[PDB]
Amino acid sequence: IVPSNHYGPIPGIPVGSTWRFRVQVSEAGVHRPHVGGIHGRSNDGAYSLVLAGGFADEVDRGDEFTYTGSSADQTLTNMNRALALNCDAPLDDKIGAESRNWRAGKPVRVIRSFKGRKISKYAPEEGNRYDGIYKVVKYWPEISSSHGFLVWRYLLRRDDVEPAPWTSEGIERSRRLCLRLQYPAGYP
Amino acid sequence: IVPSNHYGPIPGIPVGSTWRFRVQVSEAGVHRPHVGGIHGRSNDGAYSLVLAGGFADEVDRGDEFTYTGSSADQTLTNMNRALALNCDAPLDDKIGAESRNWRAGKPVRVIRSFKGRKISKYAPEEGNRYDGIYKVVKYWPEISSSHGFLVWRYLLRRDDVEPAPWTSEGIERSRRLCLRLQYPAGYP
DNA sequence: GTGATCGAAGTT
DNA sequence: AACTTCGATCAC
Q: What is the 3-state secondary structure (H, E, C) of A83-103?
A: HHHCCCCCCCCCCCEECCCHH
Q: Please state, in angstroms and rounded to a whole number, the distance separating the CA atoms of residues B48 and B134.
A: 9
Between CA A104 and CA A112, with CA A108 as vertex, the angle to 5 degrees is: 140
Question: What is the amino acid identity at position B128?
Answer: N
Alpha helix locations (H) across chain B?
22-28, 79-85, 168-176
β-sheet bridge partners, residue B118: none
Tallying the residues shown for chain B, one arrives at 188
What Å distances lie between residue A168 and A31, A164, B29, CA to CA? 26, 8, 46
A154 SS3 class: strand
Query: Burial letters for B136-161: b for 16+ Cβ neighbours within 10 Å, e otherwise?
Result: bbbbebeebeeeeeebbbbbbbbebe
Breaks (C-N over 2.5 A) in chain B follow: 70
Would you give the end-to-end CA distance of chain B in angstroms? 29
Q: Please state, in angstroms and rounded to a whole number, the distance separating the CA atoms of residues A93 and A75.
A: 8
Q: Please state, in angstroms and rounded to a whole number, the distance separating the CA atoms of residues B99 and B102.
A: 5
Tallying the residues shown for chain A, one arrives at 188
**Domains identified in chain A and CATH numbers:** 18-188 (2.30.280.10)
Q: How many CB atoms lie within 10 A of CB B71?
A: 5
Q: Does at least one atom of strand D sit less than 7 Å from the CB of B78?
A: yes
Q: Please state, in angstroms and rounded to a whole number, the distance separating the CA atoms of residues A35 and B164.
A: 36
Torsion of CA A23, A43, A136, A50, to 10 degrees: 10
Resolution to one decimal, Å: 3.8
Which nucleotide shows the minimum CA-to-C1' distance to residue A50? C6
Torsion of CA A179, A180, A181, A183, to 10 degrees: -90
What Å distances lie between residue B77 and B38, B41, B106, B147, CA to CA? 12, 10, 18, 21
Q: Which helix (H) or strand (E) holds A82?
A: helix A79-85
| Residues 6 or more apart whose Cβ sits within 8 Å of residue B147 | none
Left if phi > 0, otherwise alpha if psi is -120 to 50, otherwise beta: which for A8? Answer: left
Query: Burial letters for B32-58: b for 16+ Cβ neighbours within 10 Å, e otherwise?
Result: eeeeebbbbebeebbbbbbbbbbbeeb
Q: What are phi and psi of B16, to 5 degrees?
A: 115, -10
Distance A7 CA to D5 C1' (A): 35
Distance A118 CA to D2 C1' (A): 14
β-sheet bridge partners, residue B134: B158
Which nucleotide shows the minimum CA-to-C1' distance to residue A37? C6
CB B131 within 8 A of CB B123: no
Distance B112 CA to D9 C1' (A): 22
List all nucleotides in chain D with at least one atom under 7 A from a protein Cβ: 4-12
Q: Which helix (H) or strand (E) holds A3?
A: none
Q: Does at least one atom of strand C sit less than 7 Å from the CB of A34?
A: yes
CB B9 within 8 A of CB B133: yes
**Residue in A60, A71, A73, A72 with CA at minimum distance from that of residue A154:** A60
B55 SS3 class: coil
A118 SS3 class: helix
Q: Does at least one atom of strand D sit less than 7 Å from the CB of A34?
A: yes
Q: How many CB atoms lie within 10 A of CB A138?
A: 18
Q: Does at least one atom of strand C sit less than 7 Å from the CB of A21?
A: yes
β-sheet bridge partners, residue B48: B39, B109
Q: Does at least one atom of strand D sit less than 7 Å from the CB of A39?
A: yes
| Residues 6 or more apart whose Cβ sits within 8 Å of residue B28 | B10, B13, B19
In window 32-51 of B, residues with CB < 7 A from nucleic chain C are 32-36, 39-44, 47
Distance A118 CA to D1 C1' (A): 12
Q: Please state, in angstroms and rounded to a whole number, the distance separating the CA atoms of residues B105 and B135.
A: 6
What Å distances lie between residue B97 and A12, A36, A144, CA to CA? 62, 41, 45
For chain B, list the strands marked E by DSSP.
Answer: 18-19, 38-41, 45-51, 64-68, 97-98, 108-113, 128-143, 150-158
The string of DSSP letters for B89-120 reads: S---TTT-EE-SSGGGSPPEEEEEEGGGGGT-
Distance A21 CA to C8 C1' (A): 9
Q: How far is CA A136 from the centre of its chain?
A: 10
**Residue in B26, B75, B24 with CA at minimum distance from that of residue B181:** B24
| Residues 6 or more apart whose Cβ sits within 8 Å of residue A81 | A42, A43, A91
CB A153 within 8 A of CB A66: yes
**Residue in A121, A130, A176 with CA at minimum distance from that of residue A30:** A130
CB A135 within 8 A of CB A159: yes
Q: Does at least one atom of strand C sit less than 7 Å from the CB of A67?
A: yes
CB B157 within 8 A of CB B137: yes
Q: Please state, in angstroms and rounded to a whole number, the distance separating the CA atoms of residues A77 and A95.
A: 15
Which nucleotide shows the minimum CA-to-C1' distance to residue A68? C6
**Residue in A154, A35, A175 with CA at minimum distance from that of residue A99:** A154
In the DSSP assignment, the letter for residue A143 is E
The string of DSSP letters for A170-188 reads: HHHHHHHTT--PBPPTT--
Question: Is residue B175 classed exposed, middle or buried when 0-12, 13-18 and 19+ CB atoms within 10 A define those classes?
Answer: exposed
For chain A, list the strands marked E by DSSP.
Answer: 18-19, 38-41, 45-51, 64-68, 97-98, 108-113, 128-143, 150-158
